[PDB]
Structures are given as structure tokens and as C-alpha cells.
Symmetry: C2
Subunit: 590 residues, 2 copies
């Protein structure tokens, strides 16, 4: 057929990825993402991950499968891109080539989809879901060939994974009765892959019964609209009454007006720090600060002490940190800048020792749940690479928001493995930043900036749910501006949020004059009071952060922060949510 | 004489309004008014909160010298505690009392003559700042409202825009006398029935002749000014006089929603509830004050150093206790004496008079408080038994001129039985009702409602989850001046998942409760760690402050 014509083509597909395994959602779904990157094209958009309920309310397999992967007949191009013309035109939505497969008209499509909806409704009369959408700049020719490959991808992994096609360019397709020859399937597969591997094919004939573009359930299932609203809010297919955002909002409002259900509440947005699910805005996590320079040189010393540094790492884990943020800068520890020690030499030994010391005192199989996520405050591609290659780190914390070296973004993807990234807003360096303070609209300039970085990383296949925002308190902000940023923190209610107020100069600015600091050298009695005040002022920001549902706070003082967060969590922990009005009523009757 | 100066002594119920213009001395003006009322009219058996009021559309050393040279009342003062007042119960019902000696009018005529006063005064105000308001119930020995108005006007002249006292009610009576002309010597004769006359009495009696033109019971504006209804709602919400549509509460509620419906303004916004710690106005729910804990155990000199440290670290109030073998007296009195010496020795800055902390004494011992009060050493009684241990202590909350404030805390048992007395049918409301009952008892005994502070007593006869539950439900006190002490208590540790470690976690858990208290607008918090608490409160205050 025209299906097999070897003239190279660039198509835009939109996929849905589903699983119901809570514990392994991330590994399952990220495995599927990578086989889609490998066997289909380039991932150029992702939604958040979502824990979904229906609208009314086995692992070692994978790790071994990655070695025995059949090669693609197309080479995957890791190169960074700034835009993508085909995607820009898919959104317009401008003139593309005619569909290879036969297209149905709007009316017939709708009727065919409605049939499937009512027929499946009757069957269900005779669960937690984990959902994610993706956009693929695809080299595959047509929706059906893609479905054949999708089916193969599924079978390589096998209800553990369900991959659907939601859109494929601007086409409207309904194909009724699909009889596929095991030899026609092979020719499609061999068109894209360097090919028992026959039982796989035999399973597929039964599987592809029909084909629907857009997918049947596209506007009917909230979870799909929910995902598509992150990626392509303004998009309008010929088959839909309105744009994706407009459809999504109507669903939310109608569910509210007609059934008195808040559909948002049952359908949770997820971010991923490492390998497990985190529910957006459901926990304030403590990130422990380990500054190697401060640990070593601030008392007057001239040598790095990796042991002392690793002692502090364990002290933080015990004090209640979930994440450790480790950083160094290239510094000259003598009077003359004559000899100096590199960032690599500051951070990698400490990371190496921590990893060694972890694998020892872990003697029981049980103490591995207690393993902190590891974040590295670096803008250096080489530092990050050695960390990632020797499995020393989980998260890139990039205070330039990946603008120092955008190639650092390539190191956030391996094959199977994805790493998470913090992007922070700043201007200049520590020497210049205090003067770089003019903003046309402080709150929204920083937000738009961070949003643009996200769009860039998302365009290059960094999964949306792995990107965290940091407003960079104290970095090119006057003290009143750091305060204004906190005042307007709600502006990040849709996003994973990572902040760092700890011990910054704007805290002292909140005090009018009208032991929590462990001393490195002897400061005066008057300076000790000021440090107490600052760490306490910080604990006030922890409280504020707690109530504002900030996802991650970066602190020097873990024990103190944890104490605060434990007490606020307890106060919020209520057994019976209406017992307040029930007890009140009982008193009124008494 | 005419049965107006009838020799028979009766007991009537009067409801008064007390108003002033001056914010700075409001408390003093009004409490001087209060004391003269206790002196000259009968017994105060109820009071409203103090209120800051904006009208419906959109120096003081004289007083201190006045209080020395007051004519004695011919009627007697009785400080014994009462449990009930039948005359007052009769007024509330409203059951049968003696016939009004003053000619009454019917509902129809009263309403006409009121509207008439309204329209004539609406016209002069159309031909043309802040008010401080308080109401009281007096069980009076004065025979009739006109006599009462005569004595009221004497009080007003003694104090002389400064003070304005009105009769809101006087039993069940309805009275509208249109043209009052009173002889100079009839005024003397009324005043002489109630007050042992002979300073400069002849000339003030001249002033009063001009002053009484008419008499309206109920007062013309009773139902027509928000500030009057606001006050009365505190005291007598279920009261229904013959001349009113419904009860005071209903009349209050209907005035509130009417301002919302017809004008889109929350009337509550510019009409603020006040409580008083020492001598100044505090706006309810507008500041979380820090109370520094001074626990005395053994040196006076070191303790007084700790006090000065706390003042500088930002404590508004110091709360001193010895009672948690030298006596409680011997622990706390010398410290408080030394403090007051040391404070007076630094008169090197004459302008620090409002830099002085309010002093609170944690005691249930009458003898200790008696010595504190006699020697002007304290401002506030912090009674952890809510004055149930020795209710005679309530007598010490009034000197002639002066009123003292009081914290009423809830507990059960003593420090050794406490932990076992933990059963409650309805924890949050049991404690609330208990504190309301205690408040009702002091208010009945003439303690200003606005000087009474509530403490849920965290950790006293509460399991840890109960202490938490009390915090979770702190909103229950949104109407009340609230004082809480969580600091270093055992339940803080209950929230968490080498020995200076637990000490740290406790202080920091305390700082979490400081944050919560701030957002829940708790009026006073009792802490060991003043600097730390102040740092939290300053930061949270900055974040809340939007300036343009
Ligand atoms: N129940 C009452 N209490 C006090 N004064 C009254 C009463 N009924 C009538 N009056 C008269 O109202 C007149 C005005 O009194 P004044 O201006 O001193 O205070 P007021 O107007 O009663 O106070 P407010 O402005 O709060 O109503 C006086 O001549 C007084 O005799
Ligand atoms: N756009 C589409 N994407 C994925 N599957 C589809 C689509 N249109 C039709 N199908 C069919 O839907 C059926 C049910 O799929 P599943 O629910 O994954 O078992 C299969 O027979 C698919 O061939
Ligand atoms: Ca009296
Ligand atoms: Mg499917
Ligand atoms: Mg008056």
C-alpha cells in the first residue's frame, strides 16, 4: 500500500499513556515514553502525570528488557531545538498533506463514536488510574502503522500499559472492521524496526479491531481533557465544538452545576522527584542544604573534609530532610588566589563517600525507604555528567534555569532513566545582582520567564511533571521584592514549587529592633541574637510556606523546620471533617 | 417632696449608655463614669464590651484630682459577691414591678414624640470623628428616671464633650415628658436625697437647669443608633420592651443585614470591639501580643534582669508566678518591688511611659494579690482557677478609681489529680461554656466585660489530642479576648515523629503554634522564648503588609 511508501515524512501525533499500578506508575510510564521516543519519533510535549478516578467518585521484567531492545531503523536526534514548524502548523491548524487512510466526514465520525460510547456503557453494567499525554513528532506514515507499533510496544511490556492515539494531524478517521495478516504486520514493523517474536504478532491480530482519529473518548473522559489542557489548550479539531481549554472548563463547571461534584478534587496532579509519585500541593518537603565551601573554608581551614560533609548529610536525614541539595563553587582558600580547588573536587568526592557510606550502614533490606533524594546545585555540564554517570545524584538544581549551558538538559534523559530539574530565576552573579532590580512587573515577569524555560525543556522531551519552579528569593531582588514574591506565591498554584529563603538578608529586613545557629567562628553576643532572629524569621516562612502548600523548601536548619512542620501538620489532622458543626449543634441543643 | 422625694427606698433596674470622644483617655473617662455610677446610682450588674464607633453616615489630670474630693453618697456600698439578682431577673422577663411615679405614655404617643425628636434633629444635623461607647446595667436605689437623670447630670458636670451618660431603660416604663422646667432648689433637693452635699456645689446646680429639657424612656435613639444596639446585644440580647418590634438581638441582627442589603457595607468593619489590658484601648483580634513568662524559683536581682531582657526582646506583658520551702509571697513580691524601683530609676527617658510592660501575676492566692494591688505592683490577675478557688479575689479587681483585668483559665483538679480528670462529653463547647459561665459571674459582680480574658488552659486536665483539638477549634473564641499558653508543654512533643535536642524541638514546635496563633488572631500568647516568638510574628506581619 501507500502505507509502505518509503518517502520520509514528518507527522504530528498526540498520545495517551495509562497504567493502574500505583507503586510503579513512574517506571511503567517512563519506560513507555522511552519506547515511544525510540520507535516512533521525538517527544515534543508532555502533560503532568495524573491520578484519576472514573468521573462519578513484574518489575524485573522491565530492567532486563532494556538490554534486549531491538534497534530502530531511524536514528534518534538528541540535538536541542527552539521551535518545531510541524507542531506550529498542527496547532494553527494549517495545510498538511492528505491522509493516506480514508477519512470520514464530521457527522459520520460523531455517530460512530457515540455508538462505541453507548455500547461500552451497556457492557460495564455486565480502581485508580495513572494518566499522561505526549506529543510525538513522528516519522511513521499513518495512524494505523503507529497503532501497530504502539501494539508491539505494549506487548514488549506485557492492563499494565495502555497507549492510545488521540490525534494524528487534522485527520478524521473511523475504520470499522480490521482484518490484519500476520505478514502485513511484519512488513509494517520491519519498516521501522530492525527485527517467541511471533506469538507477539499473533496477539496483535485480535487486538486491532478498529481505529478512531480522534480517539473515541477524547472529549468524553475528563482525564484526557485534563492532560490535553496542559499541552494544547488552544487547539481546535474540526470534530470538536470548541478549543481543548474551553471544553475542559465546561466539563469542570457543568460537573459543579449539575451534580455538585468538584471534579478537580478527585483528580490529582503529580510531580516526580526521583522514582515515586508526589501529589502536587499535598506536602511541604524539606530540602537540606549542604554547601561544601561553607562546610570547609568558612572557619578558616584550607582543606576539604568529605567525612565531615557526609556526617552533616546523615545528621540531616535523621533530622527529617527528604532531599539533600549539595553544592560547591571554585574557590581560592588562601589570601592570594594562587592555588584553588575546583567544583568537581568539592562535590564529587563528598557524593562518592555518601554513596559508599549509605551502602554500608544499610545492612537490612528495610532501610532504603529512608533514602534521601539527592539534588546538585550546579550549572556545570561536566560536574553533572560525572554525577549522573556514577549514579550519584537524582535532581539537577540549575540556578541559571539551564541558560548557562542548555546542553545540561541532554543529561536529564538517559534511555529508561529520567532526571528531575529545578529552574531558578536570577540576573547576574552574586557581585552584580543587587543592582539588577528593575522589573516591569516583578511577579509576572519571573513567572513568564520560568514558564518559558519549562516550554523549552518540554519541547526537548523533558517530562513536564519533572520540572520544578524556583523564584530565587534574594537573587536580583530588593528585600521588599523578595517579600512581594512570597505575598504572591499563589501565582504558582498549578506548578511544583521549590523555594529558598533560608538565612537570606530579606528575613532580617522584616525585623524592627525598636541557640539555633551552630557557630563556625566566634561572632559577638549582638551578632548571635541576629542569627537567632534570622533562623526564627525563617521558621515563620516555613509556616507561611506550609499554608501556601509550597512543595519544597530549602533550609539550613532541618530539625527546627521539621519541628514546625510536624506541629502544623498535627493541627490540620482532623478525624471527622464536619464534627465542628456537629459538636456546635449538640451544644446549641444542650 | 410630692412622692418624688418619697422616703421609701426601692430597687429599680436601669440601663445606661456611656459615651466619649477622646481615644487617648476613653478608658479613664468611661471608668471614672463607671465608678461614679457605682458610687452614686447603685450596683453595676452588667456591662457591654467597649466599642469604637463611626457615626451612621460614612489635659486629664483634672479627673485624678476630682477623685480625691468626692462628696460621700448617702447610700451604701456592698462588695460581697452575689450569685443572682432577682430584680434583674424580673427586668429581663419582664415581670411585674411597682407603678411608675412618673406619668407614662402609650406606645402610639411615644412613637410619635420620638419620630418628632428624630426629624427635628435630622434637620439641625443637615443644616450643619470617633465615638467610644459602653453600656451598663445598674441595680439602682434611685426612685425614678428623672431623679436618675438629675444625678447623671451632676456626674457629667463633676467630670467637666468629655462624657455623655444616657438612660436607655428604667424598668418596663414608657415615658415622654415634653417640657421640663426644674427649680434650682428642687435640683439641690434631689441631689441631697442621694449625695451628702458640701466641691463648689452652687454653680454646677446653675448649669443643670439648662440641661434637662425633656425625658424619654426608652431613650429616643435606643433602636436607631447601631452603637447602642451593638452594646445592648452584649448584655441583654433577649430583652423585649413594650415599645420595640422585637428583641435586642433581633433588632441588632436586622440592623446588621439591612446595612448589607441596602448599602453593601459590613457595619462591623468600622465599629470595633475593644478589650483593655491596663489603661489603653486594644482592638479585639487586631494584634497577637507576646506575654513573657517569668517563673520564680530558688534571686530578685537576676529575675528583674530577665524582665528587662524580655521587655527589650519585645514582650508587651510579663506574667510572673512563684506558684506552679519559701512562700509564694516571698518569691514574687520582692521581685515585683525591685522591678518597680528599677523601672522608676530609669526616668532618664521621660517619654518612656508607654514603653512599660503590662504586668500579670499568675496566682490563686488572695493574700499575694492583695499585697500586689495595695502596693501598685501589678496590672492583671492571671487566675488559673478562673477565680473559683477563692472568689473573694474578685473583690480585689476594683479599687475606687481603678479596675484591674483578669485572665480566667479552664482547668480541673490540682497538678497531681489533673491528668486523670480528662473526660468531657463535648470538649470544645464544655470549656467554652465553662468560661462563659465564669465571665457571667464576674460581670454580675461588676467587673467590666471588656477586662475579662479567656484561657482554654492547654495541658491542664487535657490529654494531648484534647489540647490539639482545642487548638484546631480555636475559632470558637472569635468573639472573645483570648490568652493561651502552649509554651514548652508536653503536647508539643506529641506532634513529632542530646537532651538540648528535645528542648530545641519544643521551642520550634512552639514557634509553629505562634504562627497558627497569629493567623487565628489570638490576642495574647504566653511564651518562655520572647525573642524567637517576636521574630516569627514580625516576619508574618511583614508578609501580610501590602503598602501602596
Ligand atoms: N433617657 C434620657 N437620658 C438622657 N437624657 C435624656 C433622656 N431623655 C431625654 N433626655 C434629654 O436629652 C437632652 C440632650 O442631652 P445631651 O445632649 O446632654 O445628651 P444626649 O443627646 O441624650 O446623648 P446622645 O447624643 O448619646 O443621645 C437633654 O435635655 C436631656 O434631658
Ligand atoms: N485512536 C485509537 N487509539 C488506540 N486504540 C484504538 C483507537 N481507535 C480504535 N482503537 C481500538 O480500540 C480497541 C480497544 O483498545 P483497548 O481498550 O486498549 O483494548 C482496540 O481494538 C483498538 O484497535
Ligand atoms: Ca454601689
Ligand atoms: Mg485503549
Ligand atoms: Mg446624652
Amino acid at each position: 500500500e501507500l502505507i509502505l511508501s518509503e518517502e520520509n515524512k514528518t507527522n504530528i501525533a498526540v498520545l495517551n499513556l495509562g497504567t493502574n499500578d500505583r507503586r510503579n506508575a513512574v517506571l511503567i510510564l517512563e519506560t513507555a515514553l522511552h519506547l515511544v521516543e525510540k520507535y516512533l519519533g521525538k517527544i515534543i510535549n508532555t502533560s503532568y502525570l495524573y491520578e484519576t478516578v472514573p468521573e462519578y467518585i513484574d518489575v524485573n521484567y522491565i530492567n532486563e528488557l532494556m538490554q534486549n531492545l531491538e534497534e530502530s531503523k531511524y536514528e534518534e536526534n538528541k540535538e536541542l531545538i527552539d521551535k518545531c514548524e510541524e507542531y506550529e502548523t498542527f496547532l494553527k491548524n494549517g495545510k498538511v498533506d492528505n491522509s493516506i487512510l480514508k477519512e470520514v466526514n464530521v457527522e459520520n465520525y460523531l455517530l460512530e463514536c457515540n455508538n462505541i460510547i453507548v455500547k461500552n456503557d451497556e457492557i460495564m453494567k455486565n480502581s485508580y488510574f495513572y494518566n499522561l499525554t505526549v506529543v510525538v513528532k513522528t516519522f511513521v506514515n499513518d495512524p494505523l502503522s503507529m497503532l501497530v507499533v504502539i501494539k508491539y510496544i505494549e506487548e514488549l511490556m506485557k492492563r499494565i500499559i495502555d497507549i492510545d492515539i488521540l490525534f494524528f494531524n487534522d485527520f478524521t478517521i473511523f475504520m470499522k472492521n480490521i482484518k490484519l495478516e500476520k505478514n502485513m504486520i511484519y512488513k509494517i514493523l520491519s519498516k521501522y524496526i530492525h527485527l517467541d517474536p511471533q506469538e507477539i504478532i499473533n496477539n496483535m491480530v485480535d487486538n486491532i479491531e478498529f481505529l478512531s482519529i480522534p480517539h473515541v473518548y477524547t472529549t468524553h473522559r475528563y482525564s484526557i481533557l485534563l492532560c490535553l489542557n496542559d499541552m494544547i489548550p488552544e487547539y481546535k479539531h474540526n470534530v470538536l465544538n470548541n478549543t481543548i481549554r474551553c471544553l475542559y472548563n465546561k466539563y469542570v463547571s457543568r460537573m459543579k452545576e449539575q451534580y455538585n461534584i468538584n471534579i478537580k478534587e478527585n483528580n490529582k496532579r503529580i510531580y516526580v522527584l526521583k522514582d515515586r509519585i508526589s501529589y502536587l500541593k499535598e506536602k511541604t518537603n524539606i530540602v537540606g542544604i549542604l554547601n561544601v565551601n561553607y562546610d570547609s573554608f568558612s572557619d578558616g581551614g584550607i582543606f576539604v573534609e568529605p567525612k565531615r560533609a557526609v556526617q552533616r548529610m546523615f545528621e540531616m536525614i535523621n533530622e527529617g530532610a527528604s532531599v539533600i541539595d549539595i553544592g560547591g563553587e571554585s574557590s581560592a582558600p588562601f589570601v592570594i588566589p594562587n592555588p584553588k580547588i575546583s567544583e568537581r573536587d568539592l562535590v564529587v568526592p563528598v557524593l562518592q563517600l555518601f554513596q559508599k557510606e549509605w551502602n554500608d550502614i544499610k545492612n537490612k533490606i528495610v532501610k532504603c525507604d529512608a533514602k534521601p533524594i539527592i539534588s546538585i546545585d550546579t550549572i556545570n555540564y561536566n560536574v553533572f555528567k560525572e554525577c549522573v554517570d556514577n549514579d550519584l545524584v537524582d535532581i539537577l538544581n540549575d540556578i541559571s534555569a539551564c541558560t548557562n549551558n542548555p546542553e545540561i538538559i541532554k543529561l536529564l534523559k538517559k534511555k529508561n532513566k529520567f532526571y528531575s530539574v529545578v529552574l531558578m530565576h536570577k540576573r547576574g552573579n552574586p557581585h552584580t545582582m543587587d543592582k539588577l532590580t528593575n522589573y516591569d512587573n516583578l511577579v509576572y515577569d519571573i513567572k513568564n520567564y520560568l514558564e518559558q524555560r519549562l516550554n523549552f525543556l518540554v519541547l526537548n522531551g523533558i517530562p513536564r511533571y519533572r520540572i520544578l519552579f524556583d523564584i530565587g528569593l534574594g537573587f536580583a531582588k530588593k528585600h521588599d521584592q523578595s517579600i512581594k514574591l512570597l505575598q504572591n506565591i499563589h501565582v504558582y498554584d498549578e506548578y511544583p514549587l521549590f523555594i529558598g529563603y533560608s538565612r537570606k538578608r530579606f528575613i532580617a529586613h522584616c525585623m524592627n529592633d525598636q541557640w539555633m545557629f551552630q557557630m563556625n567562628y566566634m561572632r559577638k553576643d549582638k551578632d548571635q541574637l541576629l542569627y537567632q532572629k534570622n533562623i526564627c524569621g525563617g521558621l515563620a516562612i516555613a509556616s507561611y510556606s506550609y499554608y501556601k502548600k509550597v512543595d519544597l523548601i530549602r533550609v539550613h536548619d532541618v530539625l527546627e523546620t521539621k519541628s514546625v512542620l510536624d506541629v502544623l501538620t498535627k493541627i490540620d489532622q482532623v478525624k471527622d471533617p464536619n464534627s465542628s458543626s456537629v459538636d456546635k449543634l449538640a451544644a446549641a441543643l444542650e
